[PDB]
Design a protein around this ligand. Structure first.
Ligand SMILES: O=P(O)(O)O[C@H]1[C@@H](OP(=O)(O)O)[C@@H](OP(=O)(O)O)[C@@H](OP(=O)(O)O)[C@@H](OP(=O)(O)O)[C@H]1OP(=O)(O)O
Length: 332
């Protein structure tokens, strides 16, 4: 091991210990809460702070575990407004305009922060320009006209000549699970790389989006494609972490063919897996007892487990890089 240490075996070892120490610290706390069926918000646990700090490290690990994922943290311009935003962007996050301008041509996934909420994205950039497919894990808008302006603002961030599709999906119910959900969606995008790529071509050629999705419309101010029904592009595997049982149930009721496909290697269907994750606990409105799927909180724990294992045996430059990312979370 000394060969790759470059003579700082002590510093590398201590920084490795420090990173695994933090991950294991967060992991332990999250595991205690989940095992005891306890709401984090009622337990005074600050998931938002922990999610923001671990997220750059999760991206490093996921990129290494899946070569080609090419996951990049991005933020919209409003995320740079310290007066309105809930949190500053995660460490290493890049402004969209800056990314689009200077990034090497290729295929990217992204988690995109607007200052208070995070979405997932699949991005294709080449000589002809940039096309992006945005999937929002949250779908809370009463009037479905608010999504039209969402599609615009995203397309505006990438430039008006960029092709854009905006797909709001009813997955998130809590207020703080957008980051982990978007990370999961990014991974699924990589999983369905060819399906999203085909959609990119259609967007770039101005073809019929109905070859990829069930219901779509052009916004007609930027020409962005708003997708109010993403199936089959948004399949059962992307609905796995649905927090409300009714969201999963309603989805299957709307796309019955998705109810029998296996969503993991243990051959569970979406319904079987969701039912397995159902819990009943007190949360905050003072308190409310509800039934929902704790699938997301398990996912966060699984991701931390991955990240910790990766750091344990990661090469020294990676340890350095992840230690710095952890430290830089305190710069804003
Ligand atoms: O690579 P994938 O086929 O996409 O599935 C992997 C994972 O793989 P490994 O355990 O072998 O490392 C699990 O897969 P299973 O063993 O259960 O089949 C898991 O799935 P479950 O949570 O349902 O158990 C999870 O998937 P998910 O986040 O959708 O729940 C995860 O997926 P990712 O690679 O996207 O992180």
């Amino acid at each position: 091991p000394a060969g790759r240490q470059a003579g700082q075996q002590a510093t590398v070892d201590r920084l490795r210990t420090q990173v695994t120490g933090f991950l294991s610290g967060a992991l332990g706390k999250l595991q205690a809460l989940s095992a005891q069926n306890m709401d984090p918000e009622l337990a005074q646990f600050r998931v938002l702070d922990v999610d923001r700090a671990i997220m750059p490290l999760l991206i490093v690990a996921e990129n290494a575990r899946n070569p080609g994922l090419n996951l990049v943290p991005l933020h919209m311009d409003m995320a740079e407004d310290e007066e309105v935003r809930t949190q500053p962007p995660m460490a290493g996050s890049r402004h969209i305009a800056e990314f689009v301008a200077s990034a090497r041509p290729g295929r990217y996934r992204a988690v995109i922060d607007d200052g208070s909420h995070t979405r997932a994205a699949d991005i294709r950039k080449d000589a002809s320009g940039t096309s992006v497919i945005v999937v929002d894990p949250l779908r809370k808008e009463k009037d479905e006209s608010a999504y039209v302006d969402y599609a615009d603002n995203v397309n505006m961030e990438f430039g008006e000549h960029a092709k854009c599709a905006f797909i709001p999906v009813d997955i998130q119910k809590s207020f703080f699970d957008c980051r982990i959900l978007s990370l999961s969606l990014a991974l699924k995008m990589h999983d369905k790389d060819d399906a999203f790529a085909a959609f990119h071509e259609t967007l770039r050629n101005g073809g019929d989006p109905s070859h990829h999705v069930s219901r779509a419309q052009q916004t007609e101010e930027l020409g962005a494609t708003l997708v109010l029904d993403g199936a089959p592009l948004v399949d059962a595997r992307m609905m796995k972490h649905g927090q409300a049982a009714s969201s999963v149930s309603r989805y299957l009721g709307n796309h019955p063919e998705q109810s029998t496909v296996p969503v993991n290697k243990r051959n569970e269907t979406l319904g079987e897996r969701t039912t397995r994750h159902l819990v009943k606990r007190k949360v905050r409105n003072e308190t409310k007892e509800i039934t929902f799927s704790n699938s997301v909180e398990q996912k966060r724990i699984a991701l931390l487990n991955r990240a910790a294992s990766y750091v344990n045996s990661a090469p020294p430059p990676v340890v350095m890089r992840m230690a710095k990312l952890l430290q830089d979370s305190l710069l804003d």
